[PDB]
């Protein structure tokens, strides 16, 4: 009985092997196979691609801890987004739901409830002790829960407790649950990101990196405020060049969003990957160049 699946792939980024010792198709397959010896829950299929394996676990959490200590072990790899495994029960198609149990200071209770609300979660139990904390229990589709561990930890300032586990399958919620609405900012080249470019770009959305970040072509470097994707230049600037042509301000950069693995997984769409190394997490389009992406969308 498995509930979520994703693809574990060899890291083909221009940066492969620069951060983790273990990068082979062989080494990854060997390591997955080894995991299957003590993980009853886990399923690993070879695919029509020698560099890609479809991995299925009890849920996203289980896949993520596996990715996380492959990281620790020196592995480099790319993963596709966690997809829930729909199942046809009777005639209707249904999706997995989890039970989440939370324990929070009352101070955080409103925010946490709101957030789970927004992720299509259903209040089942609410139980204050009289000492300032409160237990909540929700039932939420797996699809909507992905990403919440990190949200919860941040919004609770690390004081909250969270436990989630597969409950059951039920009729599918409607819509783009867990699905990013915005577009991404994609780097058009390889090099060192500079503040003079980032300064202009941060007007366009929210950046994932800052001055001095080493970047390649196809790497996703931020969130676009509009729904469409933007191929941008973060190696040299144009905004201040334009500013002097009227006014001038001082270059000040908003701190970048730093994303946990779980968040990177929540964020990416079908055409992207999370690049994962022992010391770094990156996001990229599957097709690294703008030329490739254009070709894909055309017929
Ligand atoms: Mg998503
Ligand atoms: Mg989108």
Numbering used by the authors: 304 to 549, 551 to 603
Provide the authors' original text about this structure:
BipA (TypA or YihK) is a member of the translational GTPase protein family, to which translational factors EF-G,2 EF-Tu, and IF2 also belong. The translational GTPase BipA regulates the expression of virulence and pathogenicity factors in several eubacteria. Full-length BipA can be subdivided into five domains. Beginning from the N terminus, the first four domains are homologous to domains I, II, III, and V of EF-G, whereas the last domain at the C terminus is distinct and protein-specific.
To evaluate the significance of the bound cations and to resolve the long, disordered, polar region, we set out to crystallize a C-terminal fragment of BipA consisting of domains III and V and the C-terminal domain in the presence of magnesium ions. This fragment of BipA crystallized in the P41212 space group in the presence of 1 mm magnesium ions and diffracted to 2.5 Å. The structure of the C-terminal fragment is similar to that of the corresponding part of the full-length protein structure and to the C-terminal fragment of V. parahaemolyticus BipA. However, domain V is rotated toward the interface of the C-terminal domain and domain III. In addition, nearly all of the long, basic, disordered region is now structured, and the position of the [Co(NH3)6]3+ ion in the full-length protein structure has been replaced by two proximal magnesium ions. One magnesium ion has supplanted the [Co(NH3)6]3+ ion, and the other is close to the pivot point of the rotation of domain V. This placement of the magnesium ions in the C-terminal domain increases the positive surface charge in the proximity of the conserved basic C-terminal helix essential for ribosome binding of BipA (29). The isolated C-terminal fragment of BipA adopts an even more compact unit, occupying a smaller volume in the presence of magnesium. This observed compaction suggests that the C-terminal superdomain forms a functional unit even on the ribosome, similar to the superdomain structure seen in the crystal structure of EF-G bound to ribosomes. Modeling the structure of the isolated C-terminal fragment into the structure of the full-length protein results only in minor clashes between domains I and V. The presence of additional magnesium ions in the C-terminal domain increases the positive charge near the regions of the protein predicted to interact with ribosomes.
